[PDB]
């Protein structure tokens, strides 16, 4: 299991326990539920790039104690 560090806007450090097998689609939607907002409202930025639904931890280069940022999109959802 990989423990990613999600940096919240209020300095909240979220520890998302992911697995190097699942898709980031499941992760993106689950995080939205954790906050209580609809999917596509929050953009996940990794190294300046936005995490897509078909994205996988196998690509880009995700590891343990990795830093991922989450921001609210102008679309609102």
């Amino acid at each position: 299991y990989i423990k990613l560090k999600v940096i919240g806007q209020d300095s909240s450090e979220i520890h998302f326990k992911v697995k190097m097998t699942t898709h980031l689609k499941k992760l993106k939607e689950s995080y939205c539920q954790r906050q209580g907002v609809p999917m596509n409202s929050l953009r996940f930025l990794f190294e300046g790039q936005r995490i897509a639904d078909n994205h996988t931890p196998k690509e880009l280069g995700m590891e343990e104690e990795d830093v991922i940022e989450v921001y609210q999109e102008q679309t609102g959802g």
Partner: peptide, 12 residues
């Protein structure tokens, strides 16, 4: 200094 743990389920 705030840590929240979330667990994800993986589809076989």
């Amino acid at each position: 200094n705030n840590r929240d743990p979330i667990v994800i389920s993986d589809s076989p």
